Symmetry: D2
């Protein structure tokens, strides 16, 4: 199967740790990068798949931004677990007139540390 | 003051209710979509500078599919004295093989108001 | 049908004008906002649809950014032509290490001016 | 110096050749995807400060479908002395009715190198 629980690291030099996905599929973890912000997510548990679909939020302790990730767990063709993800990074604006430029979008690949 | 606890609605006629957010900043809620189908939502509201219009984010875990939708946004105070939720979302679909990852993520927009 | 050719305006106070889609589907136009940058695009011409799918690029004359739009022409339920679009706004970075924060993503609805 | 004229390849094994860009800054090319299927591409390279690594953008008009793919990017000079094209893309699908607009746009990533 492909568990999320554990430590992961990405193509950007940003490690990550994930707790034990509970009954209803929730979990928490921590995110580390050049700080240490809290993480909260949910892995889709329906057809009890082996390559689950998931999503989590990160509220930074060093600023008023939020990043959300969606992604899937894959057992790569080379046998490794890989989290392919995509994110939305929201910035805090002042006026509803500047909303248009608050969202950034990116990719990010993780692996077991 | 822009608070997230409440019952919001949108441009697609999708309802959502969010409970009270705790000390840390998290909350849960329900997402009634479109059949009528409910789904639990879990997310956090940023609480750095206790800014009246915070930045939030949550996950929707579809009960009727094996996909996930993550939402980011800003609780804005509308000009006429109301709250509006501008959000962006990314819908992830489950694909059997890593080879089709490229076609598994959609992006869209949503905007909510007090029900 | 739903022609792109003409003047359009959006929910952001940014007008736009489009030339005569040629044989192969290409076109040019101009974009106006609070400057006046050039526009180049292509409307998908295959099944000669009445609500075509399209895409164009905008290279700003006031900075080193580019925005690309994809979208479709719809005859709304109220009978109006509406261009629903989504864009990617790329910023110029210095190092391949900062690439991650160059792309912004948004929505934008147009109507016949 | 990062020039766009050339034959690039990628992580998906999709080839692309772009011609010479004119004074204004536009170019055309071919997009060989995956059957082998070619598609004309049209785009512009930003030419403000004549910056060695410019910002570009183009459209791919699929010959085999009624969809459009727009690409943005930056011609970066890789650390070991090569050119890399980091791009983001948005794939638009044709939907019969405006009611399903929300589910018609995908977003992804691509990265190219000299073939
Ligand atoms: O706006 C500018 O020009 C730069 C501003 C200073 C840095 C801004 N950063 C923030 O607010 C939060 C840091 C987020 C790091 C991101 S999340 C998306 C991406 N994936 C990953 O593993 N790290 C990056
Ligand atoms: O893949 C196809 O071609 C269609 C598949 C059938 C429907 C797929 N839908 C799902 O798995 C979950 C429903 C999510 C509804 C989305 S979340 C993003 C958007 N915002 C909103 O308020 N509703 C929609
Ligand atoms: O980076 C900041 O904090 C702000 C920088 C100053 C303004 C940046 N703007 C640019 O480089 C180009 C202007 C693009 C306007 C955008 S294109 C996406 C959106 N749709 C539309 O009709 N107008 C806006
Ligand atoms: O809608 C479905 O469920 C699948 C439909 C059949 C395939 C749809 N494809 C198309 O209409 C055009 C092919 C585009 C290929 C894309 S462009 C974005 C990505 N980058 C790249 O190098 N190849 C892919
Ligand atoms: C964890 O991963 C490696 C080694 O542990 C290194 O990047 C650093 O120690 C950590 N990464 C981050 C982003 O802190
Ligand atoms: C939810 O919104 C209101 C409830 O206040 C109701 O009139 C409407 O029909 C409901 N819509 C959905 C999608 O559940
Ligand atoms: C064109 O649209 C209206 C009236 O023509 C107004 O916004 C302005 O004159 C123009 N718009 C822009 C963005 O220049
Ligand atoms: C294109 O790339 C090279 C041509 O130099 C060739 O070996 C490869 O098979 C081609 N791939 C596609 C998708 O056309």
């Amino acid at each position: 199967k492909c568990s999320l629980t554990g430590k992961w690291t990405n193509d950007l030099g940003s490690n990550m740790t994930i707790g034990a996905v509970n009954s209803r599929g929730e979990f928490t973890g921590t995110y580390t990068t050049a700080k240490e912000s809290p993480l909260h997510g949910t892995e889709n548990t329906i057809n009890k798949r082996t390559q689950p679909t998931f999503g989590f939020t990160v509220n930074w302790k060093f600023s008023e931004s939020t990043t959300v990730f969606t992604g899937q767990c894959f057992i790569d063709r080379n046998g490794k677990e890989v989290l392919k993800t995509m994110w939305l990074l929201r910035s805090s604006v002042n006026d509803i007139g500047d909303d248009w430029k608050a969202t950034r979008v990116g990719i990010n690949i993780f692996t077991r540390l």
